[PDB]
Scaffold this active site. Structure first.
Site, PDB file in Angstrom:
ATOM      1  N   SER A 185      41.968 -91.518 -10.773  1.00 43.81           N
ATOM      2  CA  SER A 185      41.288 -90.774  -9.390  1.00 43.81           C
ATOM      3  C   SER A 185      40.067 -91.656  -8.782  1.00 43.81           C
ATOM      4  O   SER A 185      39.647 -92.414  -9.691  1.00 43.81           O
ATOM      5  CB  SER A 185      40.706 -89.688  -9.743  1.00 43.81           C
ATOM      6  OG  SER A 185      39.982 -88.830  -8.535  1.00 43.81           O
ATOM      7  N   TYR A 241      34.084 -85.696 -15.043  1.00 41.51           N
ATOM      8  CA  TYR A 241      35.492 -85.805 -14.718  1.00 41.51           C
ATOM      9  C   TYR A 241      35.854 -87.357 -14.360  1.00 41.51           C
ATOM     10  O   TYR A 241      36.671 -87.956 -14.894  1.00 41.51           O
ATOM     11  CB  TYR A 241      35.791 -85.088 -13.514  1.00 41.51           C
ATOM     12  CG  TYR A 241      37.503 -85.248 -13.014  1.00 41.51           C
ATOM     13  CD1 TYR A 241      38.360 -84.318 -13.484  1.00 41.51           C
ATOM     14  CD2 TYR A 241      37.653 -86.226 -12.004  1.00 41.51           C
ATOM     15  CE1 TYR A 241      39.769 -84.518 -13.235  1.00 41.51           C
ATOM     16  CE2 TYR A 241      39.066 -86.226 -11.681  1.00 41.51           C
ATOM     17  CZ  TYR A 241      39.943 -85.344 -12.345  1.00 41.51           C
ATOM     18  OH  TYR A 241      41.202 -85.621 -12.057  1.00 41.51           O
ATOM     19  N   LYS A 293      37.925 -89.914 -16.763  1.00 43.73           N
ATOM     20  CA  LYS A 293      38.938 -91.011 -16.070  1.00 43.73           C
ATOM     21  C   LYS A 293      38.749 -92.383 -16.203  1.00 43.73           C
ATOM     22  O   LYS A 293      39.654 -93.218 -16.696  1.00 43.73           O
ATOM     23  CB  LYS A 293      39.352 -90.645 -14.420  1.00 43.73           C
ATOM     24  CG  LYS A 293      39.862 -89.081 -14.406  1.00 43.73           C
ATOM     25  CD  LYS A 293      41.272 -88.872 -15.293  1.00 43.73           C
ATOM     26  CE  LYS A 293      41.948 -87.853 -14.639  1.00 43.73           C
ATOM     27  NZ  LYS A 293      43.132 -87.428 -15.246  1.00 43.73           N
TER      28      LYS A 293
END
Lengths: 342, 342
Positions: free
Chosen positions: A141, A165, A169
């Site tokens: 992402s 998050y 990633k």
């Protein structure tokens, strides 16, 4: 007959595709596209393994083997159970979303990091046992990037995420490149832009407005715009997101080289530009359904959303996405609204 | 007496420093410097906890509390045991070297990643319990960078390591920034250059020649040069390496900001420049002790060694290192050879 004069088969042996996060919007659309295409690119799809925390549905019109079940990749033995089925291509799409990961430190690290690590290690161990070496396509992402960010962001820009998050990633990306280098699997990391227009219903994420201000007006419903028109962000359609995955599954890893995590193409656009595209495509009355209601809390968060990327390597490698919001809106009308606003 | 007219104490309350990897060259020199200085910068050092896989020695001339023991941070309960002692500053220096990590996949990930994660999580849990929030100074490495690399490498250049060791360090960096942001500890990542001149005996690492060609000639011993003079690499003295750690322990984390992992200053120099410095400082007869014996296997590896960094942020923040090989050689003579070649 007996005589052949050269190659005869359209297709190689069939393949088994696994999709983790199969019940999510991207996973379902990926499954549907693979069923429609029938193969990838010259191997018929003979089997799907479909796993998500929520029960995935067996795809309609598919006649091959299906193993669709509710499971958590982070749970004891689940990674090993998937790897024992020896899928040829693994699409790893599953994650708990950033909002959840931020509020629940443990859950985010468990699902977004540990579960991925468990999968990668299960593959590694199988590679050691019998040479198992699948294609692994992982959805990273643009959340791996954190402010301050240039516009546009070059391919070589460091990953300094300001969310757990994004951190998870970025770590998965590093593991993916190292395991790929050591020859355990053929990994490709796909850094998804913001998906716009996201189909369905307004999701409560602070950033939902990027889709809401188009999706709702296109079906005659009102939407709130909480930020000014100058706000700039980086987008691709669901169609494009799926296209990235299909392309990543087949791309020559030697052309990609050891830097396996790729910034996807997409479109940098202001909110003003989104609205002007809506005006052009759907008209004044659609634009009139947007209610400008400032929200200073969302506005403060705009600073931490990525403005746009160069995506030079990915474009050279044949990944493609929309280049205008008119295109994004047209994709939504074609794919979600039956090609017509009536 | 009864009357005071303002602040009176030179010192605040004493502090407890922990050093993990305390028996390594950097750890021992760090311990020695802290003993000599007596405080950091205004807190007397009241206690050392010294941990390494090899038994650390209690520092000479230190009169405070000492807990020196052989332990592996990755082993069950060890991280918790350290954190229960609530050190104010934790220098995390321990790692299995790249050569070992490359040949032993499991051991490298266990010691260089998992052990660090265990430490970070033990701190996090204690922070939740009683507000424990130590300074954590972590030695990362220029090994987080992988070819192709520009010369010089800018501060914003991505981490694409081509070793498991570099991968492990890059992941630890990301964890360090995220845990720091979430307020579990005050982390600072120090990306060490190649240490030159490394004191002691030729280490078998392919890159040992960078130190060997200076260290041995300075004491009248021969050394092999396996590569051409144009080879360019990025260096700092042991003194500088220690200086980075002292500085990182006290630096205002608000000045550093959320990007807690810093490329250290140092010196980019060719092998030719190293030799010319040796000629200038030690003379023709020292240079004559260098035997040019090409080794194509080491030469091939030169491509993957970093040429040099801008180190702009770190220099702005007050980190310093040598700016010539004459300086590096002078540091070695002063610190290792008693200030004299006789």
């Amino acid at each position: 007959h007996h005589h052949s004069s050269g190659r005869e088969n359209l297709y190689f042996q069939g393949m088994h595709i696994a999709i983790i996060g199969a019940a999510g919007m991207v996973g379902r659309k990926l499954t549907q596209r693979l069923v429609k295409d029938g193969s990838l690119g010259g191997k018929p799809v003979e089997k799907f393994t479909l796993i998500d925390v929520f029960q995935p549905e067996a795809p309609a019109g598919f006649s091959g083997a299906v193993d669709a079940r509710a499971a958590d990749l982070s749970a004891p033995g689940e990674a090993e159970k998937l790897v024992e089925a020896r899928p040829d291509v693994i699409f790893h799409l599953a994650a708990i979303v950033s909002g959840e990961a931020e509020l629940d430190f443990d859950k985010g690290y468990r699902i977004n990091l540990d579960g991925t690590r468990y999968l990668f290690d299960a593959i590694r161990i199988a590679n050691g046992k019998d040479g198992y070496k699948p294609r692994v396509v992982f959805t990273s992402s643009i959340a791996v990037f954190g402010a301050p960010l240039p516009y546009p962001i070059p391919d070589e820009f460091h990953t300094t995420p300001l969310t757990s998050y994004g951190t998870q990633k970025a770590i998965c990306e590093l593991l993916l490149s190292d395991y790929s280098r050591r020859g355990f699997f053929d990994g490709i990391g796909i850094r998804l832009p913001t998906i716009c227009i996201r189909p369905g219903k307004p999701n409560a994420a602070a950033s939902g407005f990027f889709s809401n201000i188009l999706r709702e007006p296109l079906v005659g419903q009102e939407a709130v715009l909480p930020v000014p028109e100058s706000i700039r962000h980086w987008h691709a359609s669901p169609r494009s997101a799926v296209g990235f995955l299909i392309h990543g599954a087949m791309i020559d890893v030697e052309k990609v080289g050891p830097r396996r995590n790729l910034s996807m193409p997409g479109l940098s656009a202001t909110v003003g530009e989104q609205i002007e595209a809506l005006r052009k495509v759907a008209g004044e009355k659609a634009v009139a359904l947007i209610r400008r209601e400032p929200n200073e809390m969302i506005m403060r968060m705009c600073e931490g959303w990525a403005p746009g990327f160069e995506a030079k390597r990915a474009r050279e490698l044949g990944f493609t996405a929309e280049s205008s919001f008119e295109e994004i809106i047209q994709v939504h009308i074609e794919d979600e609204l039956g090609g017509s606003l009536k």
